[PDB]
Design a protein around this ligand. Structure first.
Ligand SMILES: O=c1c(O)c(-c2ccc(O)cc2)oc2cc(O)cc(O)c12
Length: 275
């Protein structure tokens, strides 16, 4: 599939850079014809087939295809796609309140504040999983706030760079995200499904409540080893006045066997969450 090959600068003016990762750089931008603001993500293309610099066209096309499907208040939306020899440029919805990661670093939350973020994440993931989309990279830095100067910030899930449509209950691709948040099936290179996202939600919940990362070791390999062995515990110093139902929620997500792990529907019916 090809994208718009006119110069993006003829239609948009760029401004503040919002951040960058290994292959993408994201800049605030404004569409000239409407004055409406967006986030332009510039994704570096592979220059040769055997290269490992840049993103393969197959991976870029998968991300765009998934993004085009989604319209939900808790997930980022895609406006337009441009490309040139060097980059594919995704014109995305602007979410300007910054990362949940940075929000947590400025402030530990209450269980109310924790559940208010978590419930939105769950609703967003419920939508994705209903469409058989596994995100595969759920973590606080991939959660963006619309406005962080409000008591109960609204959030949107971003970064669909590892996302896959799961048409057969599982996928068996490369797929490996951030060690602190990946499920044991990812660590062990086993077939992956929607269950992996639910493990990541358990990790996120643990962090939301405690300010600590449950499997984090001194090196990347230690963290991965901890994940595979389900080496975590609720430290009393962090959790002594956290409700037992909150711990039960996390406990039923941080389960090695994907089949025994809570699904997104289970998580919404869990007594800690259910109205
Ligand atoms: O740093 C990043 C970032 O800020 C954003 C972003 C911010 C606001 C939006 O409205 C949309 C995206 O996306 C990203 C996507 C990546 O793959 C890697 C990144 O580093 C970012």
């Amino acid at each position: 599939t090809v994208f718009r090959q006119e110069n993006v600068d003829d239609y948009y003016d760029t401004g503040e850079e919002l951040g960058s990762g290994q292959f993408a750089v994201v800049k605030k931008c404004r569409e000239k014809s409407t004055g409406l603001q967006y986030a332009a993500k510039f994704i570096k293309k592979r220059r040769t087939k055997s290269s490992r610099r840049g993103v393969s066209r197959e991976d870029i096309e998968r991300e765009v295809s998934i993004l085009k499907e989604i319209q939900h208040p808790n997930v980022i939306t895609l406006h337009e796609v441009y490309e040139n020899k060097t980059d594919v440029i995704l014109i995305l919805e602007l979410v300007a309140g910054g990362e949940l990661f940075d929000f947590l670093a400025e402030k530990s939350l209450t269980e109310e504040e924790a559940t208010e973020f978590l419930k939105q994440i769950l609703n967003g993931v419920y939508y994705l999983h209903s469409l058989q989309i596994a995100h595969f990279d759920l973590k606080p830095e991939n959660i963006m706030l619309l406005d962080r100067n409000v008591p109960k910030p609204r959030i949107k899930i971003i970064d669909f760079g590892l996302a896959h449509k799961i048409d057969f209950g599982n996928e068996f691709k490369n797929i490996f995200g951030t060690p602190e948040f990946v499920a044991p099936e990812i660590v062990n290179y086993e077939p992956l499904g929607l269950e992996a996202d639910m493990w990541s939600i358990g990790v996120i919940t643990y962090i939301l409540l405690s300010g600590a990362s449950p499997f984090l070791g001194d090196t990347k390999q230690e963290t991965l080893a901890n994940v595979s062995a389900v080496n975590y515990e609720f430290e009393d110093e962090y959790f002594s006045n956290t409700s037992a139902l909150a711990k039960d929620f996390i406990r039923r997500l941080l389960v090695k066997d994907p089949k025994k792990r809570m699904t997104i529907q289970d998580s919404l019916q869990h007594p800690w969450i259910k109205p």
